[PDB]
């Protein structure tokens, strides 16, 4: 991974959780990426999210780890996550743990440069996910959710 090359605006296309409720329409975890900005230690990230129906903004920034590849943040407790493949021109795969209260739970995300990504993608993504644990169920297309789009 060339991660200088994540850099930019992109779009949340699928969301999902071995902890459903985290990406339900009140969960912590369902939010709508507007950039990715990439620095030295860091990778900044603007979302949405909606709030009691109205759009809101969620600013985080995310540092490397001791870990290559993996970065951490606070966010609804404690976050660790890793890219899991990219084109970097079209679609990026995201894996994350979340642990609070010593309980965990994985959230995995694909994002596009555009607002929709075409349906090989969608589905290298459902069998990513299944590869996790993360059942057909718990994957969630946001392309038919309020993304927020009109508030970027
Ligand atoms: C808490 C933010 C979370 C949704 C993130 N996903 C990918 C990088 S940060
Ligand atoms: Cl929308």
Redesign the pocket.
């Known amino acids: 991974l060339n991660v200088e090359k994540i850099n930019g605006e992109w779009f949340s296309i699928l969301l999902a959780s071995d902890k459903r409720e985290k990406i339900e329409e009140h969960g912590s975890?369902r939010?709508f990426?507007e950039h990715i900005h990439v620095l030295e230690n860091s990778?900044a990230?603007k979302?949405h999210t909606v709030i009691d129906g109205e759009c809101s903004e969620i600013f985080?920034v995310?540092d490397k780890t001791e870990k290559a590849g993996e970065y951490s943040?606070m966010?609804?407790g404690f976050?660790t996550?890793t890219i899991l493949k990219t084109d970097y021109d079209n679609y990026i795969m995201?894996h994350?743990i979340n642990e609070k209260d010593g309980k965990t739970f994985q959230?995995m995300?694909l994002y596009g440069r555009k607002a929709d990504l075409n349906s090989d993608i969608k589905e290298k993504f459902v069998k990513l996910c299944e590869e996790h644990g993360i059942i057909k169920e718990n994957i969630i297309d946001l392309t038919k959710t309020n993304r927020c789009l009109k508030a970027r």
Request: glycine content about 0%; charged content about 10%.
């Open positions: 975890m939010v990426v990778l990230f979302f985080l995310a943040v966010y609804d976050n996550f995201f994350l959230l995300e």
